[model samples]
Target: ACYCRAPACIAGERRYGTCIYQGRLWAFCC
Candidate 1:
C-alpha cells in the first residue's frame, strides 16, 4: 500500500504516472 513519497517523490524511483488513491489523484503512481 505504498504510494508516492508525498511532498516530494523519492530519488531514483520509477514513476508510473498519475494514479487514483483514496478517491483522489496522486503523482507518480509507483
Candidate 2:
C-alpha cells in the first residue's frame, strides 16, 4: 500500500505514525 487504503492492513487505515505497518508497505510504514 502506497497510501491509506487498506487491501492489506488489518486496521484498514492509513494512520502513518499511529502504529506499526512497515513490513506491509504503506505511507509511513508499509
Candidate 3:
C-alpha cells in the first residue's frame, strides 16, 4: 500500500500514486 497525494484522488476514486502495492484503491485524507 502506498500513499497518494494527488488532488484528483478523492475518497471514492482510485489513487494516482505510482507506488501502489496491494490491489487496494483510493485513500482518505486525515
Candidate 4:
C-alpha cells in the first residue's frame, strides 16, 4: 500500500514517518 500517493499529509493527523519509493524518497505520514 506504499504507492506514494498525495492528497498530502496533515500535520496533526500524522502518525507515521517518511518512505523510500522506487529510486527516490518522500516525506510522508500515515
Candidate 5:
C-alpha cells in the first residue's frame, strides 16, 4: 500500500529513491 495518505507528505507520492519494504527494494512509489 502506497503512502497515499493525507497530511501531505513532503516526499509526495513516493520517496526520491528505492525503499526496502516487505523484504524487497521497492521503487520510488512507497
Candidate 6:
C-alpha cells in the first residue's frame, strides 16, 4: 500500500490515487 495525495501517483508503478479501475477509484494505505 501507499499514501497518495492526487488522483494519480506516478512513481515507478502505474498506480493511481483515484484510478477508475473497472469503474471505481481506490485509496491505499501505507
Model 6 C-alpha lDDT per residue in residues 1-30, reported as the tens digit of each score? 566434555455555335345565654424
Best by lDDT: 1
Runs with alpha carbons beyond 4 Å of true place in candidate 1 = 1-5
Provide TM-scores for the models. Answer: 0.39, 0.17, 0.20, 0.30, 0.33, 0.23
* Clash count, predicted structure 5: 0
lDDT value for model 2: 0.44
Flag regions of model 3 displaced more than 4 Å: 1-5, 18-30
lDDT of 2 by residue, 1-30 (tens): 644433443564445553335555443424
How well is each residue in 1-30 modelled by candidate 1, as lDDT tens digits?
Answer: 347545445766666676666776666634
Top-down TM-score ranking: 1, 5, 4, 6, 3, 2
Highest TM-score model number:
1
Q: Name the TM-score of candidate 4.
A: 0.30
Query: Which residue pairs in candidate 6 collide?
Result: none
- Whole-model Cα lDDT per candidate? 0.59, 0.44, 0.45, 0.52, 0.50, 0.49
What lDDT tens digits, residue by residue, belong to model 4 across residues 1-30? 233434455555563566666755554665
**Which pairs in model 5 have colliding backbones?**
none
Compute the lDDT of residue 23 as modeled in candidate 5.
Answer: 62
Tell me the tens digit of each residue's lDDT in model 5 across 1-30.
454333333464655456566766655445
Task: Give candidate 6's error at residue 28 in angstroms.
Answer: 6.8
